[model samples]
Target: SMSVKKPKRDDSKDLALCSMILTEMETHEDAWPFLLPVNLKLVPGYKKVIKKPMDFSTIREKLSSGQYPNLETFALDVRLVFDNCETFNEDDSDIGRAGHNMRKYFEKKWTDTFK
Candidate 1:
C-alpha cells in the first residue's frame, strides 16, 4: 500500500509469481520425488543432511497460507529443494539430475514471471 502517512509491505507481484511457479513445479517431470516432504524415517539421516527440506506441496501450502513475505523468501524455499538435493544426492544420480533440471527451469521461469 502506498500512502503519505504509512507505507505497508507489498507483495502482490511476488504472490502471483509464487502461485504460477508452484503450479508448474507440481507438474514438472521430476516432481514425483519432490511432491511431498522427504520421509525422515524412510530416508534416515535426511534431517542431518538437509537443515531445511522444502518441497512442492509444502511450498504450495506456504504460498496459499500467506506465509511467504516476499518473492525472495519464496525463492529461498524453492531453491532449498535443489540445494538439499545437491548435498544429499550425487550429481550423477537421477534425483540429483532432476533437481538441476528443475532449478534451471524455475530460474528461467522466475526471470520471466517476476517483475
Candidate 2:
C-alpha cells in the first residue's frame, strides 16, 4: 500500500535543480535535438518513444514526484529524456560538449550545492 505522507525534501533545492536542468535545455543548442526525430545516420535502429518536446512544467512535475526517490534517480530520468542524443560522438562536437555539461551539472555541481 502507498503511504499517505509524501517524502520530505528541501523545496528550494529541488526547484533549483529543476530550474538548472531546464535552463540547460533551453540554452544548449544540442539540447533541442533531443526533441526532434532521431538522426538515422547516427543511430540506425533507434526508436523514438517521446514525441513532444521536453518542457519545464512536465519536468517540474516529475522532479517533485517521490518516484524519483533521490538525486541519482532524478538525474537518470533527466538523462533518459535526452537519450536521443546518445549517439552523438565526436572529440569536439557540440553534442558531446552538451552531454559533458549535463554530467558536470548533475554529477558535480549538484553535489556541491548541498555541501
Candidate 3:
C-alpha cells in the first residue's frame, strides 16, 4: 500500500536510508556491489534486471497495478539505474563543496517555490 501524497523532497536522510536498504540487499548472493559509484565497480546481475527510460513512474505504475515489488526489489531496481550514473564527474575533494553549494542554491531557489 502506498500513500497519496509523497514527501516534500527526497533529501540526504532519504539517501542514507536508501543506502542502508542497499546494505541489506547485498546480503542476497544475487545482489552485491550495488552500483558503479565513481570507482566503476558494478554489482553482479545489475544489467540483467534494470532497463532504459529511467523514472519513478515505472515503479509507481507497477505498484499501483498490484505487480509491485517489495522494498528490496524496488531498492535494487532503483540502484541499478543509479549505479551506472556518470552524471557528476567531480573529484572526491569537490564532493563536500558541491554539496554545500547545491544545498545553498536549492534552498535559495526552490524553497519559495513550494510555498
Candidate 4:
C-alpha cells in the first residue's frame, strides 16, 4: 500500500504483513493454520480442503490427480494477524488492500513458477 513502507526481503516484516493479509479473507478459515508453520498461506480464491484434520495429503492427492493443475504447493505459514472488529479496527484497510494486490501479483508469479 502507498501508506505502508515496502517490506525488506531479509526482514520478516513483509512476510508478517503477507500473513495478516491472508487471514482477512474469511472464506478460507482452516487454511491459515496449516500454512502457519511455513509462514505462508493458500492462494486466494483457491483453497485446499482437508478431509481429515491437518491432513494436507488429501489436498496433495487432489493436486497430483490434476484437481488443481494450476496450483502446485500451498503456503505453510499463516494465522490470525488481526484479532477482529473488537481488537483490530480497519475496514479493508491499506494492509488488507495490499494483501489483495500481493495475492494477485504473487499468484501470477506462482502459477507461472509452478508451470
RMSD of each: 3.4, 6.3, 14.4, 15.9
Which candidate should be chosen as best, given TM-score against the real structure? 1
Whole-model Cα lDDT of every candidate shown, in order? 0.86, 0.54, 0.38, 0.35
Task: In model 1, state the lDDT of residue 6.
Answer: 57
Superposed on all Cα atoms, model 3 deviates from the true structure by an RMSD in Å of 14.4
What TM-scores do the predictions have? 0.86, 0.46, 0.29, 0.26
The top-ranked prediction according to lDDT is 1
Q: Which stretches of candidate 1 lie over 4 Å from their true place?
A: 1-11
> What are the per-residue Cα lDDT tens digits for candidate 1 across 1-115?
3455655556556677678888998998887878999998899889887888898899999989989877888999989988988989889989988999999999999898764
Candidate 1 vs candidate 3: the TM-score winner is 1
For 3-42, candidate 4 gives per-residue lDDT tens digits of: 7987654533433333343344323433332332221164
Instruction: Please give the lDDT score for candidate 4.
Output: 0.35
Question: Model 3 residue 34 lDDT?
Answer: 25
lDDT by residue (1-115, candidate 3, tens digit) is: 3677765663434434434433433343422222222222354543444334232345344434645334445544553334333233232434434434333443343334332
Flag regions of model 3 displaced more than 4 Å: 1-53, 87-115
Badly placed stretches (over 4 Å) of model 4 are 1-74, 78-91
